[PDB]
Design a protein around this ligand. Structure first.
Ligand SMILES: *[C@@H]1O[C@H](CO)[C@@H](O[C@@H]2O[C@H](CO)[C@@H](O)[C@H](O)[C@H]2NC(C)=O)[C@H](O)[C@H]1NC(C)=O
Ligand SMILES: *[C@@H]1O[C@H](CO)[C@@H](O[C@@H]2O[C@H](CO)[C@@H](O)[C@H](O)[C@H]2NC(C)=O)[C@H](O)[C@H]1NC(C)=O
Ligand SMILES: *[C@@H]1O[C@H](CO)[C@@H](O)[C@H](O)[C@H]1NC(C)=O
Ligand SMILES: *[C@@H]1O[C@H](CO)[C@@H](O)[C@H](O)[C@H]1NC(C)=O
Lengths: 99, 106, 8
């Protein structure tokens, strides 16, 4: 019945080309970046991937901002709970707010 | 400034542009090791000042992260913060004191 | 450092 906007654009010579990287391959890049971040650290971006426990990586991250290692190693569960609550808050804010 | 840990750069002119030679540092030959976040000695937790604790199976060493240069564990490169029942993954080992054997040796 | 050498 009513002509679609996409068909009205197509019938006058206005086409849209597809991107080279599909959504699954962009997601594969994102998954590779996330796995290299959480299992190796910053070493995979500056050479080969060097495996390290995540607690030692976060202790290095606190050393990067002028805080010593005992702050992490004495408050590991508190930081884990705060990170999990932050991720849940991002999830709830993305589910509710659409702006 | 180039891929890897950046060391230097050198400029060169080019027709309508510039060319940078980025001299950088890349680690080469990895090696597996067993690590611990801290060492409980005499009921006190010891953390490294700079570096990381590694072990080749029997003895523990402390070394910097970007190069395998193992050294024996002393009180000069470790600091004490609290006891050893809070940190998870902590191990039992001894820490050499650089003063007392030289004191009795005199 | 001083009390330890005072002990010795
Ligand atoms: C530092 O702040 C954290 C929260 O950011 C406090 O942890 C809370 O402590 C209260 C009472 O001890 C608990 O009811 C909460 O469940 C804790 N929150 C979390 C996320 O674990 C912590 O007590 C504060 N530290 C000090 C010394 O006040
Ligand atoms: C792990 O490192 C230690 C470092 O002390 C090695 O022990 C030395 O091994 C050499 C020969 O490989 C001996 O000549 C030394 O006397 C040893 N030192 C001590 C203090 O015993 C050890 O061989 C290494 N390898 C393992 C345990 O497989
Ligand atoms: C270390 O151990 C892992 C698991 O056995 C192995 O895949 C890897 O090749 C080893 N060597 C290095 C240098 O990572
Ligand atoms: C370390 O030694 C103490 C006392 O010597 C002991 O209570 C503790 O269980 C030991 N830790 C481990 C992991 O064996």
């Amino acid at each position: 019945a009513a002509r679609d906007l996409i068909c009205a654009q197509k019938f006058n010579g206005l086409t849209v080309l597809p991107p080279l990287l599909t959504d699954e391959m962009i997601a594969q890049y994102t998954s590779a970046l996330l796995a290299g971040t959480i299992t190796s650290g910053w070493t995979f971006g500056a050479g080969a991937a060097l495996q390290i426990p995540f607690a030692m990586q976060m202790a290095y991250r606190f050393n990067g901002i002028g805080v010593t290692q005992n702050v992490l190693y004495e408050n590991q569960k508190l930081i884990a709970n705060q990170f999990n609550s932050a991720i849940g808050k991002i999830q709830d804010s993305l589910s509710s707010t659409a702006s | 400034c180039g891929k890897g840990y950046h060391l230097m750069s050198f400029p060169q002119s080019a027709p309508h542009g510039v060319v940078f030679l980025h001299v950088t540092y890349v680690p080469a030959q990895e090696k597996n090791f067993t690590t611990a976040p801290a060492i409980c000695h005499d009921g006190k937790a010891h953390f490294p000042r700079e570096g990381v604790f590694v072990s080749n199976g029997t003895h523990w060493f402390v070394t910097q992260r970007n190069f395998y240069e193992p050294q024996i564990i002393t009180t000069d490169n470790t600091f004490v913060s609290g006891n050893c029942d809070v940190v998870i993954g902590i191990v039992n080992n001894t820490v050499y004191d650089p003063l007392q054997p030289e004191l009795d040796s005199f």
